[PDB]
Amino acid sequence: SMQDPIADMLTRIRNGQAANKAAVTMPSSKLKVAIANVLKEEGFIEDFKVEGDTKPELELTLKYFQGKAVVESIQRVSRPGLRIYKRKDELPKVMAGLGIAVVSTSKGVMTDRAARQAGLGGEIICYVA
Amino acid sequence: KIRTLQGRVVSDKMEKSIVVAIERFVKHPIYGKFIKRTTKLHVHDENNECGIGDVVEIRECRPLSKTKSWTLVRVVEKAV
């Protein structure tokens, strides 16, 4: 938004699915995709397209199961002026491991799993679930 | 070598000495939030070739004066 970008992103999706929306959109950004991969490649979205070599556009194709949405439990965390950082023995574990928390480790951003799997900490992001 | 610090020579109205307020960060021991701080020291500059609005690294050493225990090591930035 007119301050913190990513914040809006996580919202856009949670909002859309809230009203069985097709697929919300937002101006794509390198960090936006790094968090996008951990969605399509982590089972949470169909896929994301692009548009604009100079004026990009992210496209998170939401999903829904039986009679409810898929990604129905997302929230930001390491927001500005409150950024959170934790060590390996502090790493998160979204909803008792049942969920996932995007973590921007020194070795690229990746799901909570790859965090311990790779053995290292990173800028915790959201609590996808 | 120590570690030094690219502090700010806020003061220079002294001789062979200059008050410098070093910027610092730290997480709140409760609410947890990176906050800026300051470290005003009485550096020493025999030749007094620093200047205000500038930027220099300071190093601790023998107690030169009552409060002045640091000396100038280099002037990274300067001008105004």
Next chain:
Amino acid sequence: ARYLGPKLKLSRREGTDLFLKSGVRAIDTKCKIEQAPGQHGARKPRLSDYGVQLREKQKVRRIYGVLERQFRNYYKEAARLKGNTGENLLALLEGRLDNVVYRMGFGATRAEARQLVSHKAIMVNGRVVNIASYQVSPNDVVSIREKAKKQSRVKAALELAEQREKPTWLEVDAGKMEGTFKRKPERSDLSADINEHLIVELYSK
């Protein structure tokens, strides 16, 4: 102490036989199973959601003859030792030299046994022991003192040791009056319908 008073009057405030006084008849008359535990036997003591854990208390408690404090120390630790804190408690209440010695035919009533141990008349794993609240670990070489193997108590007692649902978690041969705690009394084998889903709550407040 340990109540040291009327056992039946106390068993009424519970109903289900809490062992204690036995080796003869008891129950069905000669006790008044919930007929008049005090004076208002008729007036139904409709307990509350709290009354349970509390009324339950006296059972898993008085049945073994213990105080209120000594019990807590047990439970509190009954949580420390890894594993289901629930049953992890009954175990200690079992290894107690009280029920142990008693459950091997020695003495008719646990209290009758508490006297034996207290009077040096009891021996275990070689060296003598006269302290009831002694955590009797398994494999020990328990046996009555040969300095009184033939007295009377243990005699007219070891007899009903047969009727007592032969314990599996251990092996006791009335022969020379010796026995060894095989292994922990896994809840199940502990012939009791007692509900412990309270003992863990009433003390978890």
Next chain:
Amino acid sequence: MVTIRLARHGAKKRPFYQVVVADSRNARNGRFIERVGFFNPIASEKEEGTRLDLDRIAHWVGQGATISDRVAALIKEVNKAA
């Protein structure tokens, strides 16, 4: 005047001393540099019961560790050469 002396740390009647390298003018068992082994005065033959960390002893005597009597006796009392 650093040295390896003894410091009582056992319950009443049943004392459990603790040899440690400390200063001469030091209290009973307070200020101390480093605890080198101990000594339990009981019995019943429990394999061991009175270590000492021989190797640590020498580590200090090199300077001026005024190892007192009893403690010095420990070195001997225990297999110093075994």
Next chain:
Amino acid sequence: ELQEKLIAVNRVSKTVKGGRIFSFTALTVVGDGNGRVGFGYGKAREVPAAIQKAMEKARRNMINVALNNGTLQHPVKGVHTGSRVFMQPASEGTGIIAGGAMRAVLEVAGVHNVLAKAYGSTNPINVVRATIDGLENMNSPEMVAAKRGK
């Protein structure tokens, strides 16, 4: 195995022309050891005549939960009206740890060992369903890979 236990029985009244009247209220829930729960609520001019209505309405119109071995699994937390409740999975041994309603509504809902606590008001007729609301979201560890994976 339909377990049924009372939750609360207040009096409740109302004033009128001639004078005033009363309609005792009965709160009750239902469920089976498996993991089903179905609360209710009724009232009448008598403690019993009302207690029955409550249960009946309870035994009917119910929902099931993905109850695990005996406790729960993920951080359950259901809210309703003026009351916030939180339920945590208590490992085997630690019996059901709850206060008022949130207690009775569990020793019959299947859950044997669990430690939970509220935050908002203590109003029973509100805290009860507040617990169910949590179960309502209590999904199982499996099936997730189905909704997301491929």
Next chain:
Amino acid sequence: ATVNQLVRKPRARKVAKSNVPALEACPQKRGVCTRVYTTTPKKPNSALRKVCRVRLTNGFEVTSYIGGEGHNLQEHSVILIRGGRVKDLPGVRYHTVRGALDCSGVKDRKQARSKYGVKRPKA
């Protein structure tokens, strides 16, 4: 609130007022008994209860109640303040421990004798 909104002035505890001034950590203090009287209750109650204005050792003269039936409490008779307030008695935030110093315990009280003052009936 806002994190920074706190960094300026972090939350603070509301210093609870000790409803027992003539306390000073002391669970009880001796007395002097400035005078003893018989006042009336609040509003919903009646009957003239017994109260007394005893002067503490720290000069914190205050008033106390005299539980139990009857009392030998005279005037210069010293007593040991207990504490604990009352309802019908306004201000009275202390009670006189019976069976101690000068004040004698209740008479013929064969129940809850710990209070007041009665050392065993007659065995």
Next chain:
RNA sequence: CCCGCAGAAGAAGCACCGGCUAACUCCGUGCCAGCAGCCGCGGUAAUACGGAGGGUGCAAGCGUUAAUCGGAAUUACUGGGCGUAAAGCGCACGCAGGCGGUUUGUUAAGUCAGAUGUGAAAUCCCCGGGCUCAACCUGGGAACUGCAUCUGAUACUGGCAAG
């Protein structure tokens, strides 16, 4: 500490039972006497005052007081609210301060990783020994969020350069 010696012998009390709260009856009293942590008890049939009968709970102790934390998410980072319940300055401008669209390069300070000194011992805790047990005593390890230093990582944050 062990043996022997008479002989149940020398060794039970305290609080509570109107609701929270386990535990009820009968008398005496009659807004008097008195009870009372809160709501409140008593103005002739008190489970609430006093005694007894009984019961309930504790135990060589029980109860009252005093004092801290808990409950109290009731100062709320975890973990709170502000339309009407307490709560948006009457409104603007704006310094400091806090926050910062997007891409690349660089830096590596925040941060993450590993190494090292160091964070006394003793409490604590895990396992395990010594007192007949326990209290207590004791071995080893874990732990000691920490501080700094060395070398690496570069996703995000910050700095610089170019937009």
Next chain:
RNA sequence: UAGCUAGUAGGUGGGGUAACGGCUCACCUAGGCGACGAUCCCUAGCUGGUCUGAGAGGAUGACCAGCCACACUGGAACUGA
């Protein structure tokens, strides 16, 4: 309590301490500290730790151990590592 401070902040040379230094003296510059809260007022020995608590947090610093300070009150130096 919103201002505070002349041996005050720094610089030269003498002097001094076991040793750095306004530590002290002479002279010189006119600094130094402060809302990231100085100065002032009330209170308190500090820590490991202790109590409570799910944890974070709150309360506390008796006995054991490390550190500091004090020795009728105010002041001072002598001996001596």
